[PDB]
């Protein structure tokens, strides 16, 4: 499983409120979070399915 | 252009020496750098052509 999948979701310094997905490795599920629109980390996906495809295995 | 493409490269805290590519802001070229194996930032590509597809405008 890529290491970034175990990082907490990162809102970042931007002032937007974009609903993105992250993989919650303790739950084993994709969940949503508020992304600020700038300087994303890699545990940040545009759909539940992409988070699980990338990080679920 | 994605907002990470004009950042300096980021080796990170890892002790590996993996040769990756970054988009060099000023020169407008993909360039190699030493990546430590962990905690990549997004201006970090496995090839020059990936750096240019993503960050070129160059």
A contacts of B40 (beta carbons < 8 Å)? 4, 42
Report residue A42 as tokens.
């890699």
Instruction: State the CATH architecture for A1-57.
Output: Irregular (4.10)
Q: Give the Cα separation of B17 and A31 in Å (integer).
A: 34
Report residue A26 as tokens.
């303790």
Which approach determined this entry?
X-ray
- Tell me whether residues A40 and B40 touch, CB distance under 8 A: no
String of DSSP letters for chain B: --TTTTSPP---S----EEEEEEETTTTEEEEEEE-SSS--SS-BSSHHHHHHHH---
Report residue B44 as tokens.
């970090």
Closest residue in A to B39 (Cα) is A4
B contacts of A4 (beta carbons < 8 Å)? 40
CATH class label, B1-58: few secondary structures
State how far residue B17 is from chain A, nearest Cα, in angstroms. 18
Coil, helix or strand at residue A50 = helix
Q: Give the Cα separation of B17 and B27 in Å (integer).
A: 24
Structure's resolution in angstroms: 1.1
The residue extents of the domains of chain A are 1-57
């Amino acid at each position: 499983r890529p290491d970034f999948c175990l990082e907490p979701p990162y809102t970042g310094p931007g002032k937007a409120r974009i609903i993105r997905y992250f993989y919650n490795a303790k739950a084993g599920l994709a969940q949503t979070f508020v992304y600020g629109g700038a300087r994303a980390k890699r545990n940040n996906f545009k759909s539940a399915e992409d988070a699980l495809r990338t990080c679920g295995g």
